Amino acid sequence: HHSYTWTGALITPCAAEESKLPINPLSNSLLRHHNMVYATTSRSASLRQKKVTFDRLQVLDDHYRDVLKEMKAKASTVKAKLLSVEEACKLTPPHSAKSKFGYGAKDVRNLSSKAVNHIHSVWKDLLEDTVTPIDTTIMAKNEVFCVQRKPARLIVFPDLGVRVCEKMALYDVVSTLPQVVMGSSYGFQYSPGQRVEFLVNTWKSKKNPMGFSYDTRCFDSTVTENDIRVEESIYQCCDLAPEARQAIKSLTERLYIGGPLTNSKGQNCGYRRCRASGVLTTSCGNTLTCYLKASAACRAAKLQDCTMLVNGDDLVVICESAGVQEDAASLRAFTEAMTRYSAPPGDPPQPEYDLELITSCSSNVSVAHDASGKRVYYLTRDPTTPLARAAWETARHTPVNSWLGNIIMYAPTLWARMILMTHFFSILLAQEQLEKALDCQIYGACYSIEPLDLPQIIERLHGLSAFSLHSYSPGEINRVASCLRKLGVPPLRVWRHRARSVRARLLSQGGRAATCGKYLFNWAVKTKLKLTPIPAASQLDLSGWFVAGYSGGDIYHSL
Ligand SMILES: CNC(=O)c1c(-c2ccc(F)cc2)oc2cc(N(C)S(C)(=O)=O)c(-c3ccc4c(n3)-c3cc5c(F)cccc5n3CO4)cc12
């Protein structure tokens, strides 16, 4: 019952891999301690192979099926549509992996005869054959990190044409079903502001609250054949088209339950009998399965009035405290129940009695005050990885503009404001590329964002508060200042002076650039300005952004 089977054929790269941090003329103005930033190469694969390969034992009790019965009752109310070849195509990222059958993401998007005809052929094959496994490619992910070295994380994905077909059958399912099944617990519906709003309102809803995060070790590898089959039965509860029922049935048996692994060179690396990293249903499946096992463990553990938040594999449980000795006991029962459902933790879960001490998705809640002195809750994180990736992106132009994702995800934070905005606007001005749109991958999907749109984007994701925050927690300020010392990043005082300049430079540019100057760098001035909401913000079409998450989803959005 192993998560993976292997042959001995190595996981081979598709290109040349740079491990050591590239050095520009701009590099030293951001990060001086270069020997601390590295990128994971395919050389590291053999170590992840070991970690992600283990046997899984599942013991399903009455709490599991009781919760499943309920999830299916909600699922039965969902009606989902079969996406047109044209709709799924228009949802393909432009720099998505090409097909082995002579067409690319650009071909797919422009609706080329060659591309359209193959998608039609793969779809037909899906409807006629429900048993032949579908091949997948195994790739080592080249991600940037800081010291104190991780091995290369792995991505399993099917051919371009299968990804278009997954979208036709399940894009509407993954979009509408999880909120119906999980309610306010489906994390992927919330904008960062909506999420902080949810946790606080939830933390407050409890007379005496206790919360904890639960992180399963290699969650993808803990997902079993029953788990994947159980998810299919949730999808099949929807009112679907017969063509969608068959295609979902086919994709499950032939791709989702598992299949063979192949490298870039095309050698059989082995077999997968667990969750694929690069399938549409990764984010959605992991959310439903994590919620199902967690909900059932709460019952098992007898946790009092538990509200939870599920985001893929990241889980947070906020419940009514029964007492410190009781909560800590209840927690070990939760872990024991979880373990039985084949989802044990990496490090054990700790009960927390302060919302600001729970960490999930590498983030935690913090406080600052808006212009009028009012306490404002925002999500923050340790700036170490965002800053090390920003240093990598200072010298190398990447398909993922980590820093732009970071600015969009963490606009109200001290560090995103003072360092990421300041540094990258300085670069954009120098290169005259403020108006040049950038594809940026955020925790799944790909977004085409024009930097000039950051003020209006931020206002709709965080509010005007983000441009007015001050009086940050000392704990936050110290986490940031220690990180800057660790990485050799100039002190925050240096960034306020540079920001005054970038601000002045943006204002002298007029229009949208001056709107970027006025709003993003208003913290830098002593003689502040009282900001108003931006007219263009309400006119931005953010439909389909936060309806759901799409891990290996291969989903694209534009403005
Ligand atoms: C179960 N755990 C949680 O729900 C999260 C917790 C938490 C839970 C309990 C706690 F006590 C303390 C923290 O913090 C999170 C931070 C998160 N960010 C990284 S952020 C600050 O919102 O941008 C996310 C998250 C996950 C997936 C996403 C996004 N965000 C996200 C933002 C985003 C965007 F701004 C534009 C476009 C796409 C976007 N996505 C697409 O996918 C989830 C969580």
Give me the DSSP letters along 99-132.
PTTS--HHHHHTT-HHHHHHHHHHHHHHHH-SSS
Burial class (CB in 10 A: 0-12, 13-18, 19+), 354: exposed
Domain membership of residue 355 as a residue range = 183-223+281-361
**39 shares a domain with 94:** no
**219 shares a domain with 101:** no
**215 shares a domain with 93:** no
Which of 508, 496, 503, 506 is CA-nearest to residue 521? 503
What sign results for the dihedral spanned by CA atoms 190, 191, 196, 200?
Answer: negative
Pocket perturbation via mutation, ligand 1, pick of 443, 447, 540, 557 by most ligand atoms within 8 A of CB: 443
Which of 168, 105, 115, 158 is CA-nearest to residue 136? 158
Question: Which regions of 158-253 does DSSP assign to beta strands (E)?
Answer: 209-215
Find the helix or strand (DSSP H, E) in which 377 lies.
Answer: strand 375-381
**479 shares a domain with 421:** yes
The whole-angstrom distance between residue 293's C-alpha and the CA centroid of its chain comes to: 21
Residue 4 three-state SS: strand
* Ligand 1 center–CA 361 separation, angstroms: 6
Which of 141, 140, 149, 139 is CA-nearest to residue 37? 149
**329 shares a domain with 411:** no
**375 shares a domain with 351:** no
**210 shares a domain with 108:** no
Declared resolution, Å: 2.8
Pocket perturbation via mutation, ligand 1, pick of 200, 214, 363, 365 by most ligand atoms within 8 A of CB: 363
Q: With DSSP H G I counted as helix, E B as strand and the rest as coil, what are the percentages for the chain, rounded to 5?
A: 50, 15, 35
Pocket perturbation via mutation, ligand 1, pick of 194, 202, 216, 311 by most ligand atoms within 8 A of CB: 311
Find the helix or strand (DSSP H, E) in which 402 lies.
Answer: helix 402-409
Which DSSP symbol is given to 81?
Answer: P
Which atom of ligand 1 approaches the CA of 443 most closely? 42
Which of 343, 345, 364, 363 is CA-nearest to residue 354? 364
Burial class (CB in 10 A: 0-12, 13-18, 19+), 98: middle
Q: What one-letter code names the amino acid at 319?
A: C
3-class DSSP string for 182-236? HHHHEHHHCCHHHHHHHHHHHHHHCCCEEEEEEEECCHHHHCCHHHHHHHHHHHC
Residue 404 CB less than 6 A away from ligand 1: no
535 neighbors 455 (Cβ within 8 angstroms):
no
Q: How many domains does the structure of the chain reveal? A: 4
The whole-angstrom distance between residue 273's C-alpha and the CA centroid of its chain comes to: 24
**317 shares a domain with 202:** yes
Query: Which token pair is 269?
Result: 């690396």
Q: Which residues contact 300 (CB under 8 A, 6 or more apart)?
A: 61, 63, 333, 334, 336, 337
**137 shares a domain with 104:** no
CA distance 305 to 200: 16
Find the helix or strand (DSSP H, E) in which 518 lies.
Answer: helix 511-520
Which atom of ligand 1 approaches the CA of 352 most closely? 11
CA distance 292 to 276: 19
CA distance 399 to 421: 19
Nearest residue (CA) to ligand 1, atom 17:
361
End position of a domain, from candidates 361, 386, 402: 361
CA distance 341 to 235: 20
CA distance 146 to 300: 39
**400 shares a domain with 353:** no
CA distance 399 to 130: 35
* Ligand 1 center–CA 192 separation, angstroms: 6
**390 shares a domain with 269:** no
What separation in angstroms does the CA of 449 have from each of 59, 94, 194, 382, 551?
Answer: 46, 14, 21, 24, 19
Query: Which token pair is 165?
Result: 């077909």
Experimental technique used to determine this entry: X-ray
Looking at the chain, how many residues does it have?
559
**117 shares a domain with 13:** no
Annotated binding-site positions for Mg(2+)? 215, 313-314
CA distance 5 to 7: 7
CA distance 303 to 112: 55
